[PDB]
Design a protein around this ligand. Structure first.
Ligand SMILES: CCCCC[C@H](O)/C=C\[C@H]1[C@H](O)CC(=O)[C@@H]1CCCCCCC(=O)O
Length: 1224
């Protein structure tokens, strides 16, 4: 019982006020919260019991539905299981709705007291005090019960999600062969990522579904009995607000998809240009790339601006709907010929605002959440309805089918009998049927016809390794007893001493899955150890030495097989004669059947030959520099001043609307009391003038809101576009060191996540936070204007709020980080367990994996529950502060009743009763903005990235230079970092004139050094001369574009063949035709009609290495180059095309300087001079005579180590080329 759980012995007062989160917050504020400081879940929150009971209900419902010939459902089971928990919360929901509906009644009863107020009447004062006390009490119980019910619903949804994921895992752990072949890991991944997550959100409004219409009808009847028939216009407007918002959301989703497809295209293009950034940087093709990038960016930003304007119009309509409804209803009421009373007006506006908020917040969210939950439940149901699964070996023609589509038998002839001590070898080509046997013996294969007889425990060894998360010792011993001799034999017999002397703490270390720290060799070692640790009788393994060195695998065989498995039943699958020495029996598979079984001797003497067969985020608040840069990048100071003035004018108009409304109410009350208070002459107030002023103020505030929203959206979109353009221009001119240090995945993440955030979530959240803050500021200003005494308690309340917000965020950040870092291991372990379902079903040890998944889900639910409790405590505190402020305002207004009219107190109370919920929404929006500002910070930091030398200086190069292309070596080297490593030193030689020259280099001892020094991507150490002219005057484009690239990554470009060969196509088509007919390129493209503008894909979907190298040589000869480089061309090439392109490049490029890099030793013979590089130093750069005459040179030893026949061939070719070169 480690990590005891709080709130288990707490009373009702501490549970209803969340007073048990004091020690956790006190620990999280002083230091960092780890995984050991968390609080365990409740006993009823365990995954095991919930999963078991929900699975029981599911199977009971399935049986009840199948017994009566109907299809089973899971929603009915969920209802029958959680109705006891839902009906209890329904009563609290109904009580809360009734309280929220009756609150405006007491509000109006309080406001009506000031109309007929009498300072000499005690009954009215007592009634007003009682009504104020009742209002305070109902507000308090509302603010409490709302968060209580929210926390209860969140806990119920979390438990439901845990139970559902447990059932899904339990059902996936029992899948059959067809189910395993019909489902992919990513399917279960997105299932457990979306379906169980929607359950935590659908339950929030599952009760609002029915709470909506009842509250709406109640408020409608109240407004009716209050004012009359003038509610019809408001109800009609509220009704027609739904289809307009529906079409607006549909158009917004369409525009969002239209921008998302372009965003995906741009992300793919960016990844393609970044993964091969050296290719574009050398060819100087940045111009056309930037052109197409800005073209796609504009094509996307058009729809982005359209969607932003649509969202701004929708937000302005949602914000002004309350004012429009109020104005329309009041115009309809005045047109009837009645009087205006402050209490009824305030009740009407409050009820209308509440109904609008409800209808436009809960109802559509409820509908969409219920639809998503129903879809998820149906998906889970159709996923769970799949087909589940049901001392010597001896079989009699067990004929089973693996491909049920074709009823033909796939493999026959099963007759095997082995004795204790035999070693059996299996050899076969691809698709021979070894996996069929390994699955039939283990029972994975469905029995159709035959016999399967095995005795004792049996284990399975997959061809690919498998492991779960945790330690290494218990991983190897698999939860069994840590026995001495067994474990010691396995560890000394698995070549683990080197691993342990390279490991941290032996087998007691925490090692993750997915190979984050373990290579293939040691992984095969540990899986072989976990397989042979059980010491079963029959052992079936499938080549566990595929990813390990040969001699060590043979040694491991000699230590394991004849020592531990020498008395066990072993049927091994071999590859070739390297493992046919200790094998007593051998079985071969030919087109699904065998011919005979016997000793390796009987099979060898028969004449059978197998040759035909063969991260440091800124902790705290973001600095103001990022905000200033983000505001100045897309807008100027005048634009910001205009936006601030527009927002201020909009807020002022929104305030003066209600101000003039209350003023007109007070004027009408005064007119009534003067015409009824002993007055004969009547003066009816001019209704047209007041109606005109009201309509003018309404249209003014509506236009102001629309304009400020449009301006905010435009400014934010322009700022995002400018930031993206600046980042692109800074990365395009950045050196290759930035791409070498930061991997491609980091750049992809920074280009995807930050861009998507700034495009979708930043503008809407920012404008919502700004609008809510402006509303709160206006409410506070109205409160201080009505009562000047509210400004006194504003300082302590504000200080307490700021301190509480900081104290809560300091812990919420760490809690969210822990939740994010604990959510992914669950899915990782799920994928790892699903990848090795064969070994799990074979070992019959599903209980261990089930318990591991249950513990992972328990930890995840624990972190989620801690986060929910922290958020609920913060919300309770915020609502309590707001309620206390409302109580203080109401008391201060009721005390000074002699100097306050009815309209003033009514407006003050109506404005104070709107802070509840709105305040916490503003706080959460500010928190989300501060959390998302890290993307803007990273974008600005990437924009402020240092640039290298300019592309071209003021000195224009001549149209003939370079003419010769002579390079002079004068102490030139390369630097990987300023003041870092250095291998090359004192490199000096002399090159020939327009004739072949060669550079030799061995693997691992200067390869990367030579590629860096010869290509010269980064600024190298030393002074470089091209034809004895200084190099520090022009960038990389005009100088390092004359080389031909022969890397492991061929020419990959998407689009028309023009942009692939020459994106600027300065020359006409005739020379291009001639060059492609010279390089034999047309005969391959004759197939498709896209001779010139065909669509090509990346990563070589339909392209081979051959035609790619051919078109590369074609582009090289099109560039009209005088320097040519070839290296490491014998990696992924076919011999035919290899010799073809070799002969072609030999006969063609024979008129100028050819800088051939010598990776092999046969292609260098056609050169003239070679300098031998060793440890970053050359010996001599002369003809091969000095290296073939002197015997102590290293060239001689390479000649021997490359083979005697190859030695004779190379020396023969050398003598030949020397004889044709000296005396022609
Ligand atoms: C009087 C309402 C009490 C609850 C808080 C409510 O959210 C009010 C605030 C509005 C804000 O003024 C505009 C807006 O969008 C808020 C509502 C947004 C959604 C609130 C529910 C939570 C959710 O949507 O996940």
């Amino acid at each position: 019982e480690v990590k005891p759980n709080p709130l288990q012995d707490a009373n009702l007062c501490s549970r209803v006020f969340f007073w048990w989160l004091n020690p956790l917050f006190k620990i999280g504020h002083k230091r960092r919260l780890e995984e050991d400081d968390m609080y365990s879940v409740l006993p009823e929150d365990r995954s095991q019991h919930l999963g078991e009971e929900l699975q029981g209900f599911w199977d009971k419902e399935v049986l009840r539905a199948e017994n009566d010939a109907q299809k089973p459902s899971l929603t009915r089971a969920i209802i029958k299981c959680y109705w006891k928990s839902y009906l209890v919360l329904g009563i609290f929901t109904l009580i809360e709705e009734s309280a929220k509906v009756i609150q405006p009644i007491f509000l109006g009863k309080i406001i009506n007291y000031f109309e007929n107020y009498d300072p000499m009447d005690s009954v009215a004062l007592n009634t007003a005090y009682a009504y104020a006390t009742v209002l305070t009490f109902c507000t308090l119980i509302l603010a409490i019960l709302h968060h209580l019910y929210f926390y209860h619903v969140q806990c119920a949804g979390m438990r439901l999600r845990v139970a559902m994921c447990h059932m899904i895992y339990r059902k996936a752990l029992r899948l059959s062969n067809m189910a395993m072949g019909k489902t992919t890991t990513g399917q279960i991944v997105n299932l457990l990522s979306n379906d169980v997550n929607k359950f935590d959100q659908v339950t929030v409004f599952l009760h609002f579904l029915w709470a909506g219409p009842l509250q709406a009808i109640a408020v409608t009847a109240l407004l009716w009995m209050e004012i009359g028939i003038s509610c019809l216009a408001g109800m009609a407007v509220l009704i027609i607000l739904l289809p307009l918002q529906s079409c607006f959301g549909k158009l917004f989703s369409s525009l969002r998809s239209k921008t998302a497809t372009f965003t995906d295209a741009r992300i793919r293009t960016m990844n393609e240009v970044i993964t091969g950034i050296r290719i574009i940087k050398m060819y100087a093709w940045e111009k056309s790339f930037s052109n197409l990038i800005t073209n796609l960016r504009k094509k996307e930003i058009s729809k982005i601006l359209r969607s932003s304007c649509l969202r701004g119009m929708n937000l302005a309509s949602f914000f002004s709907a309350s004012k429009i409804i109020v104005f329309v209803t009041f115009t309809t009421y005045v047109l009837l010929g009645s009087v205006i009373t402050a209490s009824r007006v305030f009740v009407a506006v409050t009820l209308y605002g509440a109904v609008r908020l409800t209808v436009t917040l809960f109802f559509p969210s409820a509908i969409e959440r219920v639809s998503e939950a129903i879809v998820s439940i149906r998906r889970i149901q159709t996923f769970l309805l799949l087909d589940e699964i049901s001392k010597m070996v001896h079989v009699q023609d067990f004929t089973a089918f693996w491909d049920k589509a074709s009823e033909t038998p796939t493999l026959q002839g099963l007759s095997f009998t082995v004795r204790p001590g035999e070693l059996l070898a299996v050899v076969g080509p691809v698709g021979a049927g070894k996996s069929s046997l390994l699955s039939a013996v283990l029972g994975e294969l469905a029995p159709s016809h035959g016999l399967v007889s095995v005795h004792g425990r049996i284990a399975y060894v997959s061809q690919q390794p498998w492991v779960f998360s945790g330690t290494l010792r218990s991983n190897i011993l698999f939860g069994k007893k840590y026995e001495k001799e067994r474990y010691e034999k396995v560890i000394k017999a698995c070549a683990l001493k080197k691993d342990l002397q390279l490991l941290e703490d032996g087998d007691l270390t925490v090692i993750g899955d997915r190979g984050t720290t373990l290579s293939g060799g040691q992984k095969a070692r540990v899986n072989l150890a976990r397989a042979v640790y059980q010491d079963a009788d029959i052992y079936l393994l499938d080549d566990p030495l595929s990813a390990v060195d040969a001699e060590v695998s043979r040694h491991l065989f000699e230590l394991c097989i004849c020592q531990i498995l020498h008395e066990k039943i072993t049927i091994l699958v071999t590859h070739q004669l390297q493992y046919l020495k200790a094998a007593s029996q051998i079985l071969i598979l030919k087109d699904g059947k065998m011919v005979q079984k016997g000793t390796y001797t009987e099979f060898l003497k028969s004449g059978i030959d197998f040759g035909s067969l063969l991260e440091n985020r800124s902790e705290g608040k973001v600095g103001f520099q990022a905000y200033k840069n983000y505001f100045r990048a897309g807008a100027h100071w005048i634009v910001f001043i205009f936006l601030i003035l527009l927002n201020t004018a909009a807020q002022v108009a929104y305030v003066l609307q209600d101000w003039w409304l209350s003023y007109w109410a007070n004027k009408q009350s005064m007119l009534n009391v003067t015409v009824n208070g002993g007055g004969n002459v009547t003066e009816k107030l001019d209704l047209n003038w007041y109606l005109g002023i009201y309509s003018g103020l309404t249209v003014a505030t509506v236009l102001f809101g629309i304009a400020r929203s449009l301006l905010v959206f435009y400014v934010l979109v322009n700022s995002s576009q400018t930031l993206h353009n600046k980042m692109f221009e800074s990365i395009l001119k950045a050196p290759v060191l930035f791409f070498d240090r930061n991997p491609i995945g980091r750049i992809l993440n920074r280009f995807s996540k930050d861009i998507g955030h700034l495009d979708d979530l930043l503008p809407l959240t920012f404008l919502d936070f700004i609008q809510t803050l402006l509303q709160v500021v206006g409410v506070v200003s109205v409160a201080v204007a009505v009562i000047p005494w509210i400004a006194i308690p504003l300082v302590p309340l504000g200080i307490i709020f700021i301190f509480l917000r900081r104290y809560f965020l300091e812990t919420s950040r760490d809690v969210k980080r822990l939740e994010s870092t604990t959510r992914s291991p669950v899915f990782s372990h799920l994928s790892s367990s699903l990848q090795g379902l064969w070994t799990i079903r074979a070992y019959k040890a599903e209980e261990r994996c089930q318990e591991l998944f249950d513990a992972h889900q328990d930890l995840h639910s624990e972190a989620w529950f801690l986060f929910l409790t922290t958020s609920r405590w913060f919300a309770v505190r915020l609502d309590a502060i707001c309620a206390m402020f409302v109580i203080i305002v109401a008391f201060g207004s009721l005390i000074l009743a002699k100097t306050l009219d009815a309209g003033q107190v009514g407006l003050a109370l109506s404005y104070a009763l709107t802070l509840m919920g709105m305040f916490q929404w503003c706080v959460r929006q500010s928190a989300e903005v501060e959390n998302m500002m890290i993307s803007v910070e990273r974008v600005i930091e990437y924009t402020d990235l240092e640039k290298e030398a300019p592309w071209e200086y003021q000195k224009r190069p001549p149209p003939a230079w370079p003419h010769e292309g002579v390079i002079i070596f004068d102490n030139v080297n390369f630097m990987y970092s300023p003041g870092g490593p250095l291998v090359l030193k004192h490199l000096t030689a002399l090159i020939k004139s327009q004739e072949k020259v060669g550079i030799v280099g061995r693997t691992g001892a200067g390869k990367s050094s030579l590629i860096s020094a010869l290509f010269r991507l980064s600024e190298p150490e030393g002074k470089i001369w091209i034809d004895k002219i200084l190099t520090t005057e022009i960038g990389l484009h005009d100088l390092r574009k004359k080389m031909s690239i022969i890397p492991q990554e061929p020419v990959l470009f998407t689009g028309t063949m023009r942009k692939n060969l020459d994106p600027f196509n300065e020359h006409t088509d005739e020379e291009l035709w001639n060059a492609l007919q010279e390089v034999q390129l047309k005969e391959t493209i004759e197939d498709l009609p896209g001779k010139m503008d065909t669509e090509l894909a990346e990563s070589g979907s339909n392209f081979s290495v051959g035609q790619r190298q051919l078109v590369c040589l074609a582009r090289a000869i099109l560039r009209k180059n005088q320097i040519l480089i070839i290296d490491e061309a014998t990696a992924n090439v076919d011999p035919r095309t290899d010799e073809l392109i070799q002969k072609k490049i030999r006969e063609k490029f024979a008129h100028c300087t050819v800088l051939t890099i010598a990776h092999r030793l046969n292609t260098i013979i056609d050169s003239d001079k070679i300098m031998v590089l060793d440890s970053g130093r050359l010996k001599e750069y002369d003809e091969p005579y000095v290296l073939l005459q002197n015997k102590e040179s290293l060239f001689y030893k390479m000649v021997q180590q490359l083979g005697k026949a190859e030695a004779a061939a190379l020396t023969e070719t050398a003598k030949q080329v020397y004889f044709k070169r000296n005396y022609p």
